[PDB]
Short mmCIF file of C-alpha atoms in Angstrom, two decimals:
data_model
loop_
_atom_site.label_atom_id
_atom_site.label_comp_id
_atom_site.label_asym_id
_atom_site.label_seq_id
_atom_site.Cartn_x
_atom_site.Cartn_y
_atom_site.Cartn_z
CA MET H 1 124.23 116.23 69.22
CA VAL H 2 121.27 116.91 67.11
CA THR H 3 121.80 118.46 63.47
CA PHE H 4 118.98 119.17 61.22
CA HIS H 5 119.27 120.30 57.68
CA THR H 6 117.13 123.46 56.04
CA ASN H 7 117.27 124.94 52.53
CA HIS H 8 119.60 127.90 54.12
CA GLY H 9 122.22 125.68 55.43
CA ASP H 10 123.01 123.37 58.33
CA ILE H 11 122.85 123.64 62.14
CA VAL H 12 124.17 121.95 64.70
CA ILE H 13 122.75 121.72 68.35
CA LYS H 14 124.20 120.43 71.67
CA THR H 15 121.57 119.72 74.28
CA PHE H 16 121.93 120.39 78.01
CA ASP H 17 120.95 116.84 79.54
CA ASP H 18 121.74 117.70 83.13
CA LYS H 19 120.15 120.81 82.84
CA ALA H 20 116.82 120.12 81.40
CA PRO H 21 115.96 116.51 81.72
CA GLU H 22 112.34 116.34 80.75
CA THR H 23 112.61 119.13 78.65
CA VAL H 24 115.77 117.60 76.71
CA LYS H 25 114.42 114.00 76.44
CA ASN H 26 110.75 114.97 75.21
CA UNK H 27 112.94 116.88 72.53
CA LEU H 28 114.93 114.10 71.77
CA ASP H 29 112.01 111.86 71.47
CA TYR H 30 110.65 114.04 68.44
CA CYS H 31 114.31 114.13 66.95
CA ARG H 32 114.45 110.37 66.51
CA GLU H 33 111.17 109.69 65.23
CA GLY H 34 111.00 112.00 62.72
CA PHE H 35 108.23 114.80 64.36
CA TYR H 36 110.63 117.70 63.09
CA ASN H 37 111.05 116.46 59.39
CA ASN H 38 109.41 118.55 56.84
CA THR H 39 108.22 121.26 59.25
CA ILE H 40 108.85 124.74 58.96
CA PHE H 41 109.84 128.00 61.09
CA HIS H 42 106.45 129.39 61.08
CA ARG H 43 107.18 132.65 63.50
CA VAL H 44 110.54 134.51 62.51
CA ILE H 45 111.19 138.05 64.13
CA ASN H 46 114.45 139.47 63.17
CA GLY H 47 116.35 140.88 66.47
CA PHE H 48 113.89 138.54 68.77
CA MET H 49 113.80 134.85 67.77
CA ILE H 50 112.91 132.35 65.20
CA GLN H 51 110.32 129.49 66.07
CA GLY H 52 109.28 126.32 64.41
CA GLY H 53 108.84 122.59 64.72
CA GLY H 54 105.00 122.17 65.14
CA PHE H 55 103.81 123.13 61.57
CA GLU H 56 104.18 121.38 58.08
CA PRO H 57 104.38 123.58 54.82
CA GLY H 58 101.16 125.22 54.34
CA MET H 59 100.51 126.22 57.92
CA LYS H 60 98.80 123.10 59.64
CA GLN H 61 99.36 122.42 63.23
CA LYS H 62 100.79 118.79 63.95
CA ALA H 63 99.48 116.37 66.66
CA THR H 64 101.91 116.80 69.76
CA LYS H 65 102.17 114.59 72.66
CA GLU H 66 101.40 115.53 76.35
CA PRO H 67 103.00 118.60 77.65
CA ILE H 68 106.10 118.48 79.59
CA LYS H 69 106.93 120.62 83.23
CA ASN H 70 108.98 123.87 82.85
CA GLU H 71 112.12 123.37 83.96
CA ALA H 72 113.01 127.34 83.63
CA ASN H 73 114.64 127.31 87.31
CA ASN H 74 117.91 125.83 85.80
CA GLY H 75 119.49 129.27 86.06
CA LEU H 76 120.30 129.05 82.26
CA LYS H 77 119.43 132.42 80.29
CA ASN H 78 118.00 133.03 77.00
CA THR H 79 121.15 134.09 75.82
CA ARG H 80 122.06 134.34 71.90
CA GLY H 81 122.51 130.92 70.55
CA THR H 82 120.38 129.13 73.09
CA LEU H 83 117.22 127.33 72.58
CA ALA H 84 114.15 127.27 74.64
CA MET H 85 110.68 126.08 74.60
CA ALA H 86 107.50 127.64 73.39
CA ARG H 87 104.32 127.47 75.26
CA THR H 88 101.34 128.91 75.76
CA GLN H 89 99.90 131.09 78.79
CA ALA H 90 99.81 127.91 81.13
CA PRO H 91 103.59 127.43 82.36
CA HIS H 92 103.54 123.56 81.92
CA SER H 93 102.23 123.61 78.19
CA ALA H 94 105.41 123.15 76.31
CA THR H 95 104.99 120.59 73.54
CA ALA H 96 107.03 120.49 70.31
CA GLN H 97 107.73 123.84 69.44
CA UNK H 98 110.76 125.74 70.69
CA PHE H 99 112.95 128.78 69.61
CA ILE H 100 116.42 130.12 69.00
CA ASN H 101 117.03 133.45 70.60
CA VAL H 102 119.14 135.55 68.08
CA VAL H 103 119.85 138.25 70.51
CA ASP H 104 119.96 138.42 74.64
CA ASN H 105 116.24 138.37 75.51
CA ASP H 106 116.94 138.55 79.14
CA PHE H 107 113.25 139.32 79.76
CA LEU H 108 112.24 135.64 79.10
CA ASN H 109 114.09 134.37 81.90
CA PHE H 110 112.62 132.77 84.74
CA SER H 111 111.98 135.19 87.58
CA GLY H 112 109.49 133.44 89.61
CA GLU H 113 106.57 130.84 89.55
CA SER H 114 103.75 132.93 87.93
CA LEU H 115 102.53 134.41 84.79
CA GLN H 116 105.41 137.06 83.64
CA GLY H 117 107.81 135.10 85.73
CA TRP H 118 107.78 131.21 84.64
CA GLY H 119 109.89 132.34 81.92
CA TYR H 120 110.99 130.36 79.08
CA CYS H 121 113.49 126.84 79.83
CA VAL H 122 116.51 127.09 77.82
CA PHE H 123 117.47 123.28 76.98
CA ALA H 124 120.10 123.65 73.94
CA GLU H 125 122.58 125.84 72.58
CA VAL H 126 123.79 126.18 68.86
CA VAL H 127 127.43 124.75 68.25
CA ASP H 128 127.48 125.05 64.71
CA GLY H 129 125.53 127.02 61.77
CA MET H 130 124.78 130.38 63.87
CA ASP H 131 125.46 131.92 60.57
CA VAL H 132 122.35 129.81 59.08
CA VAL H 133 120.18 131.50 61.89
CA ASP H 134 121.30 134.69 61.03
CA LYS H 135 120.20 134.36 57.22
CA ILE H 136 117.02 132.63 58.46
CA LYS H 137 116.09 135.54 60.98
CA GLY H 138 116.01 138.03 58.08
CA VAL H 139 113.88 136.53 55.51
CA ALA H 140 110.63 138.41 54.66
CA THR H 141 107.63 137.59 56.66
CA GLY H 142 103.63 138.23 56.51
CA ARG H 143 100.45 137.08 57.75
CA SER H 144 99.30 133.66 56.75
CA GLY H 145 95.98 133.13 57.86
CA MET H 146 95.44 133.23 61.65
CA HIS H 147 99.56 132.99 61.71
CA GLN H 148 101.48 135.97 61.95
CA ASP H 149 105.00 136.73 61.20
CA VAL H 150 105.10 133.83 58.84
CA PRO H 151 108.02 133.98 56.03
CA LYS H 152 107.19 134.35 52.62
CA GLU H 153 109.96 132.13 51.33
CA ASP H 154 109.21 128.66 53.44
CA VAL H 155 112.41 127.78 55.75
CA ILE H 156 111.82 123.92 56.06
CA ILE H 157 113.69 121.71 58.13
CA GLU H 158 114.20 118.49 55.77
CA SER H 159 115.78 116.27 58.30
CA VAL H 160 117.00 115.72 61.82
CA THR H 161 120.01 113.69 62.70
CA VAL H 162 120.92 112.41 66.65
CA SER H 163 124.47 111.48 67.40
CA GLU H 164 126.44 110.80 70.52
CA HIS H 165 129.98 111.93 71.60
CA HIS H 166 131.38 115.07 70.18
CA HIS H 167 134.02 117.78 70.82
CA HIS H 168 131.98 120.53 72.31
CA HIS H 169 133.28 120.38 75.46
CA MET N 1 133.01 144.18 64.55
CA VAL N 2 132.71 147.11 67.09
CA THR N 3 132.15 147.05 70.94
CA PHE N 4 131.23 149.51 73.27
CA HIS N 5 131.82 149.68 76.83
CA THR N 6 129.45 151.50 79.17
CA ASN N 7 128.96 151.87 82.88
CA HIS N 8 125.72 149.36 82.36
CA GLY N 9 127.70 146.64 80.18
CA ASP N 10 129.18 146.14 77.17
CA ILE N 11 127.35 145.92 73.57
CA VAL N 12 128.98 144.03 70.60
CA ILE N 13 127.73 145.06 67.16
CA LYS N 14 128.31 143.74 63.61
CA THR N 15 128.44 146.25 60.74
CA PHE N 16 126.79 145.88 57.18
CA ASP N 17 129.59 147.22 55.20
CA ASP N 18 128.10 145.84 51.98
CA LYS N 19 124.79 147.76 52.46
CA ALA N 20 125.77 150.98 53.82
CA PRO N 21 129.73 151.48 52.76
CA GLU N 22 129.86 155.44 53.02
CA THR N 23 127.75 155.05 56.38
CA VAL N 24 130.05 152.58 58.15
CA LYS N 25 133.36 154.04 56.83
CA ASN N 26 132.05 157.02 58.43
CA UNK N 27 131.12 155.46 61.45
CA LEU N 28 134.14 153.27 62.02
CA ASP N 29 136.41 156.67 61.39
CA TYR N 30 135.00 158.09 64.56
CA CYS N 31 135.43 154.89 66.51
CA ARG N 32 139.01 153.87 65.52
CA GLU N 33 139.92 157.63 66.64
CA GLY N 34 138.31 157.71 69.50
CA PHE N 35 135.46 160.34 68.86
CA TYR N 36 132.78 158.24 70.61
CA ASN N 37 135.06 157.63 73.75
CA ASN N 38 133.53 159.46 76.99
CA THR N 39 130.28 159.98 75.28
CA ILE N 40 126.84 159.23 76.31
CA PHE N 41 123.33 158.15 75.32
CA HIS N 42 121.61 161.74 75.38
CA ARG N 43 118.46 160.89 74.43
CA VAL N 44 116.43 157.72 75.50
CA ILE N 45 112.70 156.90 74.82
CA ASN N 46 111.36 153.77 76.12
CA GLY N 47 109.38 151.44 73.61
CA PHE N 48 111.28 153.31 70.85
CA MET N 49 115.22 153.87 70.72
CA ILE N 50 118.17 155.14 72.29
CA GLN N 51 120.18 157.72 70.50
CA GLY N 52 124.21 158.65 71.43
CA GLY N 53 127.50 159.55 69.72
CA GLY N 54 127.25 162.84 70.02
CA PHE N 55 127.59 164.34 73.53
CA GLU N 56 129.90 164.17 76.02
CA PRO N 57 128.94 163.91 79.90
CA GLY N 58 127.14 167.13 80.83
CA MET N 59 125.20 167.65 77.36
CA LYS N 60 128.40 168.96 75.47
CA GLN N 61 128.19 168.69 71.39
CA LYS N 62 131.36 167.42 70.02
CA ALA N 63 132.63 168.63 66.80
CA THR N 64 131.44 166.73 63.67
CA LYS N 65 132.86 166.41 60.53
CA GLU N 66 131.31 166.95 57.21
CA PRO N 67 127.86 165.21 56.78
CA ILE N 68 127.38 161.99 54.71
CA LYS N 69 124.95 160.73 52.00
CA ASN N 70 121.96 158.87 52.72
CA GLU N 71 122.22 155.15 52.30
CA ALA N 72 118.76 154.28 53.47
CA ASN N 73 117.42 152.82 50.01
CA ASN N 74 119.70 149.59 50.89
CA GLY N 75 116.64 147.45 51.61
CA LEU N 76 117.33 147.21 55.47
CA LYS N 77 114.48 147.96 57.68
CA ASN N 78 114.75 149.28 61.27
CA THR N 79 113.86 146.20 63.03
CA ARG N 80 114.36 145.55 67.04
CA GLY N 81 118.34 145.71 67.20
CA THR N 82 119.24 147.24 64.31
CA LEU N 83 121.32 150.60 64.26
CA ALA N 84 120.53 153.54 61.94
CA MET N 85 121.78 157.08 61.74
CA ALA N 86 120.10 160.10 63.25
CA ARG N 87 119.94 163.25 61.17
CA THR N 88 118.07 166.49 60.66
CA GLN N 89 115.46 167.17 58.28
CA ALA N 90 117.91 167.16 55.39
CA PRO N 91 118.54 163.88 54.21
CA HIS N 92 122.08 163.90 53.74
CA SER N 93 122.62 165.62 57.10
CA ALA N 94 123.70 162.40 59.24
CA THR N 95 127.44 163.26 60.67
CA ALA N 96 128.15 161.24 63.90
CA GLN N 97 125.26 160.47 65.99
CA UNK N 98 123.36 156.81 65.64
CA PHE N 99 120.24 155.03 67.62
CA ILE N 100 119.23 151.53 68.19
CA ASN N 101 115.98 150.53 67.58
CA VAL N 102 114.53 148.73 70.65
CA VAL N 103 111.21 147.45 68.78
CA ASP N 104 110.35 147.48 65.30
CA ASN N 105 109.95 151.33 63.81
CA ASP N 106 108.84 150.39 60.50
CA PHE N 107 107.74 153.99 59.81
CA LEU N 108 111.43 155.04 59.96
CA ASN N 109 112.21 152.90 56.60
CA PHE N 110 113.07 154.36 53.48
CA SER N 111 109.86 154.70 51.68
CA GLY N 112 110.59 157.29 49.28
CA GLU N 113 112.86 160.40 48.28
CA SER N 114 110.93 163.27 49.87
CA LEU N 115 110.14 164.61 53.18
CA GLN N 116 108.47 162.03 55.16
CA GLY N 117 109.63 159.58 52.92
CA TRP N 118 113.65 159.44 53.02
CA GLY N 119 113.60 157.49 56.25
CA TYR N 120 116.97 156.66 58.17
CA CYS N 121 119.68 154.37 57.16
CA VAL N 122 120.28 151.28 59.07
CA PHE N 123 124.10 150.23 58.82
CA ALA N 124 124.62 147.95 61.81
CA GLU N 125 122.64 145.50 64.46
CA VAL N 126 123.31 144.30 67.79
CA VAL N 127 124.61 140.67 68.30
CA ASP N 128 125.46 140.47 72.10
CA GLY N 129 124.32 142.71 74.75
CA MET N 130 120.54 143.52 73.90
CA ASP N 131 120.21 143.13 77.60
CA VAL N 132 122.34 145.97 78.31
CA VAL N 133 120.18 147.99 75.66
CA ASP N 134 116.97 146.82 77.08
CA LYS N 135 118.32 148.39 80.46
CA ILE N 136 119.04 151.28 79.28
CA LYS N 137 115.96 151.94 77.61
CA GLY N 138 114.36 152.30 80.98
CA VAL N 139 116.08 154.68 83.06
CA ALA N 140 114.68 157.97 83.77
CA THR N 141 114.82 160.58 81.41
CA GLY N 142 114.29 164.13 81.95
CA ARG N 143 114.79 168.01 80.03
CA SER N 144 118.35 169.34 79.91
CA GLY N 145 118.22 172.73 78.81
CA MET N 146 117.07 172.44 75.02
CA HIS N 147 117.48 168.68 74.83
CA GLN N 148 114.86 166.25 75.74
CA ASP N 149 114.17 162.66 77.32
CA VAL N 150 117.93 163.23 78.49
CA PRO N 151 118.99 160.35 81.14
CA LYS N 152 119.01 161.67 84.87
CA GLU N 153 121.66 159.32 85.46
CA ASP N 154 124.42 159.63 83.17
CA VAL N 155 124.82 156.43 80.72
CA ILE N 156 128.64 156.93 79.69
CA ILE N 157 130.50 155.21 76.99
CA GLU N 158 133.64 154.71 78.47
CA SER N 159 135.67 153.30 75.76
CA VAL N 160 135.19 152.01 72.09
CA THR N 161 136.87 148.77 71.00
CA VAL N 162 137.24 148.07 67.14
CA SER N 163 137.52 144.46 65.93
CA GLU N 164 138.96 144.40 62.36
CA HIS N 165 140.31 140.64 61.86
CA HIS N 166 138.16 137.59 62.09
CA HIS N 167 134.70 137.11 64.13
CA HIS N 168 132.04 134.92 64.74
#
């Protein structure tokens, strides 16, 4: 169980260890060491998703570890509340960035091992704090240098906490 | 909370009561009594929006109540997933028809109290079922008498359910 703290509220997240082992452990590694602390949601698209994890305030991309394999073939879909890994055009390019689907974005689902088919790997799900997500996805956005859809008011992830057992079964 | 039941799937929608009171109450009235049951999505334009609420299968326009005022000055935007009221050239002409934006349609936003400025009033937003929306926007459309972009195969809203008690 992971819980981050933003200026808009608290969000609790349950990881899918059995469905995306390489994805979750690489994700959990950044959480325990503090890579996600003092990061922002640098890309917020209402009606789509909110994305962060790789930028400090001021839009400087942090240094990430080696990429992971794409485990999107686990059958999980990019429904509302699920978390999936952000990546480049290369399918096995996911590093530290991820996003939360605010609606059902089924076109992002794994439909082959190709360009528009590899999809985006779901590895976690919001259990408590979707109300906080719905307030973040509605903020005002604009251009910030070479990046687009950057919120005017920074949504800063202040701290990340990792726990053990839980009542979300 | 409102839920549509179509032949393509269910769509769950959250209303913005504080931002569009006259719009939501008018809208919810048709939902509770059943005005929207057995209606269709009579206008589907891929990459734009899907629209319904005023036509039964066969393009028979149902009888509507008095028009409502336009509450588009509420600050809400016509981003993807949002619902807005359809209207004629007159700003206070919305009755029963509405549409779902499938992309960001910023040109529909309220940018003044004039002809090309009144915009379109957002009153709701899709929470679960955008996949059903994204499937509806892809159907084949054609002309049906004095109407354009009418789907060949009817997208029928079979039933509408209203949820007024608590919700997540």
